[PDB]
């Protein structure tokens, strides 16, 4: 049942009282499990066939230096001051340079040597070369 | 919502008409998704608190040479005849040697250069040094 999930909903994020990012609760039952988020608000994501193309991110299973679980699409800083985006890529989580490299490095459970600073959905200012906004 | 899941249930496997391995169906709804397997049969896995310690494996998102999705705990053979078990380890899928190495190699989406031969639950004979059983 394993990885933890979170969902970002851009309409929830616009709305003041609602939280754009929802951390799931998992519920086990006799024929599987359910990953529960806040109610969807970006309704254009709901297809005719019932499939919903919600923006979902999985946990790496790794903790940062502040014992925060590191997730897919987190922005993290290493001990040397370098920033990366956590990405799922061909069977592994990798750290993607964005300053102007596009190089990927397999995430190194040296994980406690990283700090989560935010994420690409909530904190896009962090992706700006001259720092934030 | 992303990775695909399968579950192995050792009691189902014992039972003739039932399949030990169940490949999930995912169902999206407005407050999340449900991963549906065959009904559980190893009832000792169900805790008082409602949590169920079912043996669940995630897809790597990678195809083998026969365009089979490669999953966690598959046994795979490479082009050189070497066998590995697919394992989830510290943020990545890795190939674990079992002949008497215990070395791990990050899975290489050279994935089409691997063949799934079976898995550790259904096909433990494959893990025997002198071949099968």
A92 vs B3, B33, B93: nearest CB: B93
Nearby residues of A130 by Cβ (< 8 Å), 6 or more positions away: none
The answer to whether residue B40 neighbours chain A at the CB level (below 8 Å) is yes
**CB contact at 8 A, A85 and A94:** no
Give whole-number Cα distances, B38 to A2, B24, B49, B68, in Å: 18, 8, 21, 21
The sign of the dihedral angle between the CA atoms of B121, B25, B34, B106 is positive
**CB contact at 8 A, B93 and A92:** yes
Q: Resolution (in Å) of the shown entry?
A: 1.8
Closest alpha carbon to A90 in B24, B36, B114: B114
Contact A92 B106 (CB under 8 A): yes
Phi, psi for B106 (deg, rounded to 5): -55, 135
How were these coordinates obtained? Answer: X-ray
Domains of chain A by start residue, with CATH: 1-60 (2.60.430.10), 61-133 (2.30.30.290)
A31 vs B1, B36, B58: nearest CB: B36
Q: b/e for B51-77, b at 16 or more Cβ within 10 A?
A: ebebbbbbbbbbebeeeebbbbbbbbb
């Amino acid at each position: 049942l394993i990885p933890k999930f979170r969902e970002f909903d851009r309409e929830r994020h616009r709305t003041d009282y609602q939280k754009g990012m929802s951390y799931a609760e998992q519920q086990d039952f006799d024929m599987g499990f359910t990953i529960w988020f806040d109610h969807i608000e970006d309704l254009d994501l709901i297809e005719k066939d019932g499939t919903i193309n919600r923006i979902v991110m999985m946990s790496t299973g790794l903790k940062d230096k502040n014992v925060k679980e590191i997730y897919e699409s987190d922005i993290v800083r290493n001990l040397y001051g370098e920033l990366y985006v956590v990405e799922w890529l061909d069977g592994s989580f990798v750290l993607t340079e964005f300053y102007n490299g596009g190089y990927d490095h397999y995430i190194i459970d040296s994980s406690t040597e990283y700090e989560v600073l935010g994420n690409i959905y909530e904190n896009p200012e962090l992706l700006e070369d001259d720092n934030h906004a």
